[PDB]
């Protein structure tokens, strides 16, 4: 299970939790509870953006693989003589 | 063949020269006004110890190749084994003679077997895609190729094993293999 959006929403929640723990501040007081939807929301944004980087990275790597095979093919056809 | 004495002398010079350099730094770093002749009075043993070790290393490896008439990694091992013993000889403790010999012998043999990339590497100069491809899908080999290296028995009994063992047993113990029958009516 590596769903990017859910994972990075969770990552933001863990950042706030660890930060509160490092600060030795209580994990849940009511007037501070808006921070978890915030940190998780920023985490969700980071992961929608990572989603689109992955799409570009995949296309770039797919083009590279074809070029290597195309390079391999022509060199092989050149050696046919 | 090679000259063990001549090659050993060069070995002593190269590492004795380095030891002489380290002797000069110790003399330069001396606090008391001892002089320029401290090179061979105080730090002189350091240069001598270095010349002794690298000379011993180049002598014994060269000798090891001559005795075995072979040029492989082992010779760098005995060379280091002897060089390490010479290193430990200065301390005067037998355990340090052996332990220092072992480390030098192991380190120098290991470097020579694997070909440490200290000055270059064994460049394949071939198609690395084809090398990894061949090793990757060489899933099934001729059986004889395996048998040539693990042999027969220990649970490896290819078809016709019994006939060969019958032949093998006759050639050694002079006994023909005729197992009895468990059925009286045959």
């Amino acid at each position: 299970m590596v769903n990017r959006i859910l994972f990075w929403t969770g990552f933001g929640l863990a950042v706030r939790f660890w930060q509160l723990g490092i600060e030795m501040r209580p994990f849940f007081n009511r007037k501070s509870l808006w921070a978890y939807p915030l940190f998780g929301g920023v985490g969700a944004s980071f992961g929608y953006w990572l989603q689109s980087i992955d799409e570009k990275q995949t296309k770039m790597l797919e083009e590279r693989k074809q070029a290597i095979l195309e390079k391999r093919a022509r060199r092989a056809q050149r050696q046919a003589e | 063949p090679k000259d063990a004495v001549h090659l050993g002398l060069k070995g002593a010079a190269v590492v004795g020269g380095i030891g002489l350099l380290f002797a000069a730094v110790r003399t330069s770093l001396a606090r008391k006004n001892v002089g320029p002749w401290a090179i061979f009075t105080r730090n002189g043993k350091l240069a001598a110890t270095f010349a002794a070790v690298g000379g011993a290393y180049d002598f014994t490896r060269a000798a090891a190749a001559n005795l075995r008439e072979k040029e492989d990694w082992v010779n760098n091992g005995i060379g280091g084994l002897f060089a390490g013993a010479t290193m430990g000889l200065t301390t005067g403790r037998i355990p340090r003679v052996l332990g220092f010999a072992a480390l030098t012998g192991v380190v120098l043999a290991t470097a020579e077997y694997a070909g440490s990339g200290l000055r270059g590497v064994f460049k394949r100069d071939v198609d690395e895609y084809e090398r990894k491809e061949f090793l990757r899908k060489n899933r099934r080999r001729p059986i004889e190729e395996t048998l040539a290296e693990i042999g027969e028995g220990r649970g490896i009994k290819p078809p016709g094993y019994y006939e060969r063992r019958a032949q093998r047993l006759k050639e050694k113990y002079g006994v023909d293999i005729n197992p009895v029958c468990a059925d009286p009516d045959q």
């Binding site: - | 990757r136 649970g155 009994k157």
Partner: protein, 494 residues
């Protein structure tokens, strides 16, 4: 969600609850220990459910989840017969180990429970991962928690013990990692269903064997690479010791069935005599030193070394009964060493504050319930029939004998010497005079807690000693796949 991921997820939830429940209720530490214990029970319930659904004769990995989202390092989970019993051993041992420390952990209780819960997840992941590099990642992940567990809760020599187990395991593992990385480079991955189809060339196998063997001999441990165990298994808290001897020793054994048998068959067969000389030497040397060991917990720790030599020789036998016996002995050792560590590190130690044998004598007079379970456990350690220990020792020893007779004959001498140190240690503690004159106060017998962790462990060894089919039936088909060889009129059918 796969049931195997649920297995890894439940303990993490309990860690989360333990670390956050202070915000919903000074919470009593009883509440913390209740959460951790129930967390382990649910993990055990899930493993039981998996086993009920598990099929005994499938060569496909079961309860797997499709990824279709490949990355550089993806956790793939799957189970077959050669891993299902190690998963069960881990989920049965973990609740018992928690109850064994219910009262003896007095400070830093939250940290103790979180480490044990994290240890449960990491050790389970070792048995379930379907990739060879995933195996190393989980195998090595347990070291920092183990370092912290020993150092926060160990006895007087805990620092030297914590360093020893960390540096020994790391050093050995670094040679295994180099072996794994070479495999990853030749094949292109370490996923089991791909690497097991590869055929490494013989010289590659030899240098792959060395490096994997160095690590597994450090972790077995073989004699001469075992001082980390004689320190760590003794200085550890009781729950740490149970986990360290019942599950952590089993990692190198399950590792042989994944990393050596299918992919290094030719090197394994050609080097079995080196393995057997080391295993034979370990059986004798460890046995003689166990006889002269005066720390009661160190004596139980040293007998683990002698038993692990027999499963190591059984795992290199290349015979069905030797391989099944190795798994059977591994499991039987887990119940018996857990019980003997409870008897020494948890019952004697809590009552006296000392681990020296010279202070104990005649405990039967005042502690009949302890002496009854302690004796049955000492018969298990001696491999007495009706324990699963006899079934595993016999099958392991038969396979070792049939593979290499001189090695089996020496290994068989364990039947004499395991009895010697087990009976000697039992006699000196429970028998051997009236109650020791060093005891000023009288001692109470087993508390209900102590009784029911010993009774449970003793129950498993005896029930499986009478009907070992409960494990063998789920072992036969999968363990066939790791045997190497052919019969002449059975092979190459047309």
């Amino acid at each position: 969600m796969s049931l195997l991921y649920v297995l890894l997820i439940i303990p993490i939830i309990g860690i989360f609850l333990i670390s956050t429940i202070d915000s919903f209720y000074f919470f009593n530490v009883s509440y913390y220990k209740k959460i951790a214990l129930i967390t382990t029970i649910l993990n055990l319930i899930v493993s039981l459910i998996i086993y009920i659904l598990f099929d005994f004769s499938n060569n496909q990995f079961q309860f797997i989840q499709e990824n279709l989202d490949l990355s550089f390092y993806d956790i793939y989970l799957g189970v077959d017969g050669v891993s299902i019993y190690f998963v069960l051993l881990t989920t049965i041992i973990m609740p018992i180990a928690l109850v064994s420390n219910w009262n003896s952990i007095t400070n830093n209780i939250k940290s103790y429970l979180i480490i044990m819960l994290l240890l449960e997840t990491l050790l389970l992941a070792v048995f379930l991962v379907l990739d060879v590099l995933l195996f190393y990642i989980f195998f090595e992940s347990i070291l920092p928690p183990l370092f912290i567990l020993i150092g926060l809760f160990g006895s007087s020599n805990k620092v030297r013990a914590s360093f020893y187990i960390f540096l020994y395991t790391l050093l050995g593992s670094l040679f295994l990692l180099l072996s794994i990385l070479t495999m990853s480079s030749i094949v292109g991955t370490t996923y089991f269903d791909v690497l097991l189809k590869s055929s490494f060339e013989y010289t590659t196998q030899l240098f792959l064997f060395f490096g994997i063997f160095i690590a597994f001999a450090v972790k077995t441990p073989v004699w001469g690479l075992n001082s980390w165990l004689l320190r760590a298994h003794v200085e550890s808290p009781l729950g740490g010791s149970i986990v360290l001897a019942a599950i952590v020793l089993k990692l190198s054994l399950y590792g042989v069935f994944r990393l050596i048998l299918p992919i290094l068959p030719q090197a394994s067969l050609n080097l079995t005599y080196i393995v057997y000389a080391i295993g034979a030497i370990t059986v004798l040397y460890a046995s003689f030193s166990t006889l002269r060991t005066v720390d009661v917990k160190e004596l139980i720790a040293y007998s683990s070394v002698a038993h692990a030599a027999i499963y190591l020789m059984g795992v290199f036998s290349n015979t069905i009964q030797g391989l099944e016996g190795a798994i059977l002995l591994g499991l039987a050792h887990g119940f018996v060493s857990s019980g003997l560590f409870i008897c020494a590190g948890g019952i004697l130690y809590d009552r006296t504050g000392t681990r020296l044998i010279y202070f104990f004598r005649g405990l039967t007079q005042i502690m009949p319930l302890f002496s009854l379970f302690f004796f049955i456990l000492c018969l298990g350690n001696a491999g007495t029939p009706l324990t699963l220990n006899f079934v595993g020792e016999f099958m392991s020893l038969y396979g070792t004998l049939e593979r290499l007779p001189i090695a089996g004959m020496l290994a068989s001498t364990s039947i004499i010497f395991s009895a010697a140190y087990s009976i000697y240690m039992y006699n000196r503690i429970a028998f051997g005079g009236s109650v020791s004159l060093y005891f000023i106060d009288c001692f109470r017998d087993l508390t209900k807690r102590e009784f029911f962790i010993l009774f449970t462990l003793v129950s498993f060894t005896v029930i499986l000693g009478i009907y070992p089919s409960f494990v063998l039936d789920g072992l036969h088909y999968n363990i066939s796949s790791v045997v190497y060889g052919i019969e002449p009129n059975a092979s190459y059918l047309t």
